[PDB]
Amino acid sequence: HDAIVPFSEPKPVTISEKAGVKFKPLLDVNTGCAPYAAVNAEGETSGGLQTSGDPESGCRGSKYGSQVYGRSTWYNDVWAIMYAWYFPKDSPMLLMGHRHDWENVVVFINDPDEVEPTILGCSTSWHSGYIKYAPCPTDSINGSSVMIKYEHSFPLNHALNITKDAGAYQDLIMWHQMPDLARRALNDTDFGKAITPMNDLNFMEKIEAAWPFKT
Ligand SMILES: *[C@@H]1O[C@H](CO)[C@@H](O[C@@H]2O[C@H](CO)[C@@H](O[C@@H]3O[C@H](CO)[C@@H](O)[C@H](O)[C@@H]3O)[C@H](O)[C@H]2NC(C)=O)[C@H](O)[C@H]1NC(C)=O
Ligand SMILES: *[C@@H]1O[C@H](CO)[C@@H](O[C@@H]2O[C@H](CO)[C@@H](O[C@@H]3O[C@H](CO)[C@@H](O)[C@H](O)[C@@H]3O)[C@H](O)[C@H]2NC(C)=O)[C@H](O)[C@H]1NC(C)=O
Ligand SMILES: *[C@@H]1O[C@H](CO)[C@@H](O)[C@H](O)[C@H]1NC(C)=O
């Protein structure tokens, strides 16, 4: 329980690293787990938590701090950045819920190599699909940080959506900055009902599913 030590956020050097840090979302959590690190540098992964009668018990926050995962690519001449969070359980009241949970938002900007790139759209994970916004509404943008809420509405489990309430930042690690042992684990580990969204199997399919523009 709470054994995984997160990666530190390295000081950004490349275009994509700098943009990754610049456009980190704010995450506000409502009645669920705080985000936890899913994997460590040695490739061990979180065991999650069994479902129980309280949505937050055991997962109010790691003694090691939190993590947010990032991965980016050009797609259809727009720059797409995925931010993903891992939670040890998703266990709402009245619902069966499950061990493990992965959520993500995809932020779309015009070009990462501008002094002030423009957010063009944003898509928030919703039970394997997305809620798509084009444009990303201004009231949910805090500087260059989209404001995201993790919450549940009966009769479905937790999901993400934009919000006007400012949350908090987590230490960001980008896919390429994790050691090969960690990427191997994120590529291969079975999280049951939760699917790791930025690993090599799923990332491009997810970016395509997240495309919010009326093309
Ligand atoms: C995802 O988030 C969006 C953004 O907040 C949600 O859309 C919003 O839904 C509410 C419905 O409660 C709309 O609220 C307004 O509320 C008053 C209540 O008195 C109503 O009278 C107004 O006519 C108006 O509908 C709000 O306009 C709407 N915003 C947008 C941009 O659509 C959306 O429901 C969330 N989706 C999920 C699945 O949770
Ligand atoms: C998920 O990410 C991991 C880590 O980046 C990828 O595993 C790494 O990539 C290849 C897998 O084909 C391995 O290289 C191969 O090693 C064998 C045995 O030494 C050699 O015969 C081949 O010529 C090739 O060099 C690499 O060792 C492996 N690393 C680890 C730690 O597993 C994996 O490919 C990714 N999965 C997907 C679906 O992309
Ligand atoms: C923007 O985020 C900060 C925390 O990062 C918060 O203190 C502030 O109230 C937010 N402002 C708006 C307008 O959302």
Author numbering: 28 to 242
Study authors write:
Necrosis and ethylene inducing peptide 1 (Nep1)-like proteins (NLPs) are widely distributed among prokaryotic and eukaryotic organisms, like fungi, bacteria and oomycetes, and may infect a range of different crops, such as potato, tomato, soybean and tobacco, thus posing major threat to agriculture worldwide. It was shown that NLPs function as cytolytic toxins that induce plasma membrane leakage by binding to plant membrane sphingolipid receptor. NLPs share a conserved necrosis inducing protein (NPP1) domain, typically containing the heptapeptide motif, GHRHDWE, which is crucial for toxicity.
To investigate structural differences between non-toxic HaNLP3 and toxic NLPs, the HaNLP3 crystal structure was determined. The HaNLP3 structure comprises a nine-stranded β-sandwich flanked by three α-helices. The structure of HaNLP3 is defined in electron density from residue His28 to residue Thr242, and is thus missing 27 N-terminal and 5 C-terminal residues. Three glycosylated sites were observed at Asn169, Asn188 and Asn214. In addition, two bound phosphate ions were observed, likely due to the crystallization conditions. Comparison of NLPPya protein surfaces in the apo- and hexose-bound states with HaNLP3 reveals that the crevice of HaNLP3 appears to be in a more closed state than the cavity of apo-NLPPya. Furthermore, HaNLP3 contains a second disulfide bond unlike NLPPya, which could play a part in HaNLP3 rigidity when interacting with the membrane.
